[PDB]
Amino acid sequence: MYTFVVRDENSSVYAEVSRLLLATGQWKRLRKDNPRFNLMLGERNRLPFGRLGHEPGLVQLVNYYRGADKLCRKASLVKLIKTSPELSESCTWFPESYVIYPTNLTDEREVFLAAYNRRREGREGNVWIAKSGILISSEASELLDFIDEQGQVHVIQKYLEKPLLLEPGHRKFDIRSWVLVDHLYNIYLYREGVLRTSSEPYNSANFQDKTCHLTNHCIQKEYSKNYGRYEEGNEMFFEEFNQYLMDALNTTLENSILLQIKHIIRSCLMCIEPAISTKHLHYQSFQLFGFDFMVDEELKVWLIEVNGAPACAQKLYAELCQGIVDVAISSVFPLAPTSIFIKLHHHH
Amino acid sequence: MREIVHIQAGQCGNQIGAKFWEVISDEHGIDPTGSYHGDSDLQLERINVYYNEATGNKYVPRAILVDLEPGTMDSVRSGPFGQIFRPDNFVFGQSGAGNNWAKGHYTEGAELVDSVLDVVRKESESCDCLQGFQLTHSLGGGTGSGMGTLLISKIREEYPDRIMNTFSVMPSPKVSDTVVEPYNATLSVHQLVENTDETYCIDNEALYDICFRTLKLTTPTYGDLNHLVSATMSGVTTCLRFPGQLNADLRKLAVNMVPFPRLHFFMPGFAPLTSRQQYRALTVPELTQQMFDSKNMMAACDPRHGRYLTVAAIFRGRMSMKEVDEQMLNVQNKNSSYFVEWIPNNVKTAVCDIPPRGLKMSATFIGNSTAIQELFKRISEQFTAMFRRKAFLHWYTGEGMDEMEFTEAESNMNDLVSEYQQYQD
Amino acid sequence: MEVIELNKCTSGQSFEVILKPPSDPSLEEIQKKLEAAEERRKYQEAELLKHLAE
Amino acid sequence: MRECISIHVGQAGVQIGNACWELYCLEHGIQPDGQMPSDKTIGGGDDSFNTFFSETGAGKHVPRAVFVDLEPTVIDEVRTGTYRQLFHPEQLITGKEDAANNYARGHYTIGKEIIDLVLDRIRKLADQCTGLQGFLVFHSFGGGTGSGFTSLLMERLSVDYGKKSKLEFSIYPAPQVSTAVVEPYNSILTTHTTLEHSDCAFMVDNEAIYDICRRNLDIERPTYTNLNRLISQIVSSITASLRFDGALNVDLTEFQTNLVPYPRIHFPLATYAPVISAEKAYHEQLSVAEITNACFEPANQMVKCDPRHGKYMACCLLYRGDVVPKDVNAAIATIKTKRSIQFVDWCPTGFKVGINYQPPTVVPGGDLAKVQRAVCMLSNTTAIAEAWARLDHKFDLMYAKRAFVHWYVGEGMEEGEFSEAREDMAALEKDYEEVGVD
Ligand SMILES: Nc1nc2c(ncn2[C@@H]2O[C@H](COP(=O)(O)OP(=O)(O)OP(=O)(O)O)[C@@H](O)[C@H]2O)c(=O)[nH]1
Ligand SMILES: Nc1ncnc2c1ncn2[C@@H]1O[C@H](COP(=O)(O)OP(=O)(O)CP(=O)(O)O)[C@@H](O)[C@H]1O
Ligand SMILES: Nc1nc2c(ncn2[C@@H]2O[C@H](COP(=O)(O)OP(=O)(O)O)[C@@H](O)[C@H]2O)c(=O)[nH]1
Ligand SMILES: O=C(COC(F)F)N1CCCC2(CC2)C1
Ligand SMILES: [Ca+2]
Ligand SMILES: [Ca+2]
Ligand SMILES: [Ca+2]
Ligand SMILES: [Mg+2]
């Protein structure tokens, strides 16, 4: 009889996993403070990794990799890419980025201004976006003044000025890919991705209205007036987006976009494997990731950010959650296909 | 040289204590005349914990037999091992106690208690370093109950910093001598709450139901019940009478089993308990499943009605100690809802290579469970059923007691129950 | 990757490797604490004997 | 030459001490009778081994050790053991009844009556020293003696030997080899009153030694003899510099200098390799880089934690056997390019290396196989704070209910000393996070 605890009541995802576990009639849920557990669906912040793997006779498994925050943080990712030799500073799938600490607090302010002035003199598009509360602007003075107004670390990166727009609509979009890494450090990619499309026509002469620029499901559902017009919940799934790429562009989602996505997921996760691997550890880790990509009018994929506690599309909770029980939990605590994942083999 | 002084008081106290020395004397190789005839030096390693060494390599138990009537003790002296007990250690009167707590505690008992302390002092003065005392007695009678608790009160006065342990038989109407047993039991429980470090609660109803349902004894006797207590008493004292990586003295066991001074009442358990299919080998999983099963519990309390504060199991015989740890960690991690989460690792296990006579391997269970409150709840209800009508009170008022003293015992135990309740949520 | 202070002897040797430059209670006070707890024991035991005397 | 007086308190300290001096004798070539054929200077000499052994005119080499236990069962083994002849009866001190796992008992009740006798016997060893360096105190966290009486001896040693250094070898409490439930209380109590009296403390978690015995030595249920024969290997590696010719960690002061930049953070993590089962017909011998690479595997750490998620403050590599500096630097280079070794910006990113050409000595009939080369890494990472977290948490679970507190108060301790001890650990855990996390 396997036992688990729940310490993140907000996790819509693992809320379903915990639901499926009990459905098997073989997983018993304990109080969140009961240290005699097999599986910890742990909290987001300040998860007590140091207390794991110290119970005699219990093989303990947790749903967060200790140290993955280096990849799921705005500033940490920029530092990781610029400093890591595996990714190098010349990484061709991550927009030019800079860490900018607010002046009321190393910092890459001058390093940022140098590239900015170079672009201004070169007649090239000099539109950047600051975030950590997001600001889009083409004047460097505005981006820095906004970060100083705040008190937290911000990151300034190049704003993709030639984004691929879906027709009809002439509208921006992003692609979410869920990626599951099990205890053996295999990289499994969910066959089902979602496009959170903007229901507004992309306008390049006005970054003030961040409705046609920010494809966030909450912004399109709060500050957009065409929400849910072309696709339900501003969410186009791989089936449709694939058929579109063929009819309009005469290419497939696999060749034009997925190969690059599968290559970006690999390079990022493999880069940090020696730092977060639980191969020879007294406990075992696995985690679900949400990668967000941008696609330009040249069919080139760019990495926006990585989410460590990602939510799933309403239509894909049952399939993915159960899949998280098959390859993540049951692979360590089996019960007495046609996989819904894509194993990205690599060298460990 | 951490000696233990044993005292047995009253009919039940002496009949059980008799079989106890009969059991361990066999395990240590001490024949009915005190001479050693074993074959393993492990028998003698800690032999001096319960025996003295006379001249000629004779081993004499360190026990003091006490009763207010000669009858019971006369039987022991004529019984199997009666010749092994020190003659001076027989301290008895002639009036009897009449199943009256007041007579054992205040009148008859008070006249004989000073002379029992004379023998206790004499046994202690011979100890290199006295661990503490252990009393065996019933609570429903008059001598073991009334005079026993008077003995503890005076032993704790002359030895305030020694461990006081008791095997206490709890009365039950299903296995009753007289209707005043709840009165005597309620009066003793308050004494034990104060002046004992560990009390092993032994319910006569549990012993009876085990003999009828599990052991398949059509008509159980007091002898039949005493077999189970003998085996249990031998089991709990295994970590004391033999060598092991434990190094457990009475005070060390108390420090790790009693998280609160008043909640020091334990539920013992034994396994196996086979009916005569008695030669079959019992596996480690079977020993464990039974040892934690309530039908093997001797307090007549369902542990699944409360939570374990601490648990201590002893395994005897040649068996995979690895497999032992596996099953123990399987019991806890399969029913963690019954162990308090605020005492980390409150379940400990010891192994012993010498099994009891006639068993390839066994397991003795010692649990400090909040479910024990159900026992005191029984006694309290039977006490109040009569006391509200003042039934049978004349026996006690005639011996010098007052009704006020009864009301206090009533409350002092209801408090005890209430204390067990808060730690159960 | 530098080696500094290399010392060799018959039974071994020792050296340093720099990979990157950087960026009581008196005796009286204890007797009191010891005796303080001894007094709290004697007071606790007095209340026990006072209890038994009653 | 300066002397080192070892002190062993409680069962764990006494038995570990027995296993170490058994090893010291095999290493230095001393027989059970205290005779040392190679020592050409009889009854005297200022050699490197004389820091741990004195010499009688009869040529006997007597450890500079004191064994103390509030109960005589454990120390009676030394009196009639194999090396019963090494010690004279004055070196072995025993009591009548122990502390029953009650810190308050070993410190106050019982310790008050025996403290002045232990110091007197130690003074007898000091009087045989021409320049006493310090003391090596071996004890356990969970025992009432090891925890309770140790902290009292440390306070008194700081008074009678103000300028002498004091290192510790402490046993961290592990449920798999313990029957005590109150060990968290004792540990947090003894660390509080000992913190400002110990200059450097090597913690060994039985949980770690236990798994190393099951994993490497194929021992299904290891005993204390197994756990101790292995710990005396690590202790040997850490004390070798004091007992052999050399230049690294030549005196007890160098331990505080090379390993403890901050006073309170005086708990270096220890990693050892290789540990090879002797029952293996023949093992392929590991290289300098492979054994050095193992020093960053959590498997062979004396305290299970993830150094990757901390910051190193210092780092010592102690090699024994066939090791030349060239190989060490080669392995280090490759390890830096593959491992996550984050140092603190206010500390050099470097490694001190010691090499002794005599490979690890193996006890005949022991569990460990003879290897050609082995290493012990003493690294001071903030990751060892994981240990304090586990312990402090168990303390909080019980103390929230005052469970078992009546036993301590009953022996004269005040309840305030509990929270006062706990609040110090809350400060200790804070000093570690300020130094490591960003
Ligand atoms: N590694 C190792 N640990 C031991 C050894 N002996 C005891 N321990 C550990 O020590 C802890 C208990 O402390 P003890 O040394 O037994 O207690 P003590 O110092 O003798 O003090 P008392 O309570 O008075 O007996 C437990 O966690 C044991 O696991 C040993 O020989 N080796
Ligand atoms: N450099 C860039 N170029 C183009 N668009 C960008 C961009 N940076 C951000 N965006 C827009 O912002 C959105 C992503 O914002 P970001 O992910 O940084 O904020 P967030 O993390 O709070 C939302 P999420 O839930 O995806 O994590 C995308 O829809 C994208 O259209
Ligand atoms: N288990 C057991 N219980 C007994 C035995 N004899 C009496 N009792 C119980 O003890 C109580 C009677 O007390 P008893 O010892 O006879 O009175 P005392 O001699 O004055 O102490 C009753 O509840 C009986 O059920 C016995 O041999 N074995
Ligand atoms: O004193 C009592 C009362 O016993 C009662 F409390 F259970 N006796 C019982 C009736 C016979 C006796 C001689 C007078 C002894
Ligand atoms: Ca009379
Ligand atoms: Ca010499
Ligand atoms: Ca000092
Ligand atoms: Mg985000």
Ligand SMILES: [Mg+2]
């Ligand atoms: Mg009777």
Ligand SMILES: [Mg+2]
């Ligand atoms: Mg001890």
